[PDB]
């Protein structure tokens, strides 16, 4: 089905353009590294509490991510309502554990997890989980 | 504006356009664009919006994200869009503006009569975005 074509675009990449909504209602755009879980139909991203994107999502959790197909022109967009963890606050906390799981999915096994844990707390990192509620776009064969 | 970010815009010709849908969510798409570095504006053509996208006709705030050629760098141009009426006849002012846009991006088209017809069939609008703010992550020496 059309949905499978769009989800194939998302599964075939690890970078996308995240659109959050500013205080005044206009879109704010940035790029993000992500992991796609096909079982739960989730996109997971690590974001830092001080950043504009995170501040925007705390106010209005609606998020979209556009992903390019392997031709660099066809694309898919996932829409959903973001679920954010609290910022990492102690090296052993549940947010840090979720960020360790994400790192393993995106980057593999870290050489010094204690360093990683410290860094997550220092950077006040947050795990953004976006359940995909809707997909649209122009996948390969349609451009 | 940061010249490093303007250079990103100058050196590419596609990006991610974001407009505002009725319910407040951004609508995203990959588009081709022209950048005028003197006037500091970006031009794209879109089919006349319908359904939730139509809100662009009452709230023309828009942004475009453009990738650099390095790992992660990017530039975003933000402004308030100016729209033509949609193309309705193959020789109307909108189509003439769209022909100039084509020339600006891609040079001389090999069959302008085919192009004119396609603009009318797609109800094509020329969106002009004078740049009000530029942000992002500038690339370094490479």
UniProtKB/Swiss-Prot annotation, chain A:
Function per UniProt: F420H(2)-dependent reductase able to catalyze the reduction of biliverdin-IXalpha to bilirubin-IXalpha in vitro. However, kinetic parameters show that it is less efficient than the biliverdin reductase Rv2074 and suggest biliverdin-IXalpha is unlikely to be the native substrate of Rv1155, which probably catalyzes the reduction of an alternative molecule in vivo. Binds coenzyme F420, but does not bind FMN or other flavins. Cannot use pyridoxine 5'-phosphate, pyridoxamine 5'-phosphate, pyridoxal 5'-phosphate (PLP), the anti-tuberculosis drug PA-824 or aflatoxin analogs as substrates.
Keyword set includes Iron-sulfur: no
Listed GO MF terms: coenzyme F420 binding; FMN binding; oxidoreductase activity, acting on the CH-CH group of donors; protein homodimerization activity; pyridoxal phosphate binding
InterPro entries, A to Z: F420-binding_dom_put (IPR019920), F420H2_bilvrd_red/Heme_oxyg (IPR052019), Pyridox_Oxase_N (IPR011576), Split_barrel_FMN-bd (IPR012349)
Record-level GO BP terms: vitamin B6 metabolic process
Name the UniProt record assigns to this protein: F420H(2)-dependent reductase Rv1155
Positions annotated to bind coenzyme F420-(gamma-Glu)n: 28, 33, 46, 52-56, 73-75, 134
Any one Pfam family match given in the protein's UniProt record, by short name: PNPOx_N
EC class name: oxidoreductase
Keyword Electron transport (UniProt): no
Complexes and interactors: Homodimer.
Lineage top rank: taxon: Bacteria
Coiled-coil annotated spans: none
Curated annotation (Swiss-Prot), chain B:
Pfam families linked: PNPOx_N (PF01243)
Keyword field contains Ion transport: no
Binding-site list for coenzyme F420-(gamma-Glu)n: 27, 32, 45, 51-55, 72-74, 133
Molecular function GO terms recorded: coenzyme F420 binding; FMN binding; oxidoreductase activity, acting on the CH-CH group of donors; protein homodimerization activity; pyridoxal phosphate binding
UniProt keyword list: Oxidoreductase
EC number: 1.-.-.-
BP terms from Gene Ontology: vitamin B6 metabolic process
Keyword Oxidoreductase among record annotations: yes
Source species, domain of life: Bacteria
Subunit annotation: Homodimer.
PANTHER family documented for this protein: F420H(2)-DEPENDENT REDUCTASE RV1155, HEME OXYGENASE HI_0854-RELATED
Protein family per UniProt: Belongs to the F420H(2)-dependent biliverdin reductase family.
Protein name, per record: F420H(2)-dependent reductase Rv1155
Organism: Mycobacterium tuberculosis (strain ATCC 25618 / H37Rv)
């Amino acid at each position: 089905v059309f949905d499978d074509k769009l989800l194939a675009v998302i599964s075939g990449n690890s970078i996308g353009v995240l659109a959050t909504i500013k205080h005044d209602g206009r879109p704010q755009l940035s790029n993000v590294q992500y992991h796609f879980d096909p079982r739960k139909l989730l996109i997971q991203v690590s974001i830092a509490e001080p950043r504009a994107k995170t501040r925007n999502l705390r106010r209005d959790p609606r998020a979209s991510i556009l992903v390019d197909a392997d031709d660099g022109w066809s694309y898919a967009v996932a829409e959903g309502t973001a679920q954010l963890t609290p910022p990492a606050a102690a090296p052993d906390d549940d947010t840090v554990e979720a960020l360790i799981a994400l790192y393993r999915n995106i980057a593999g096994e870290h050489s010094d997890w204690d360093d990683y844990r410290q860094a997550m707390v220092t950077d006040r990192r947050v795990l953004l989980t976006l359940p995909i509620s809707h997909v649209y776009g122009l996948p390969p064969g349609m451009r």
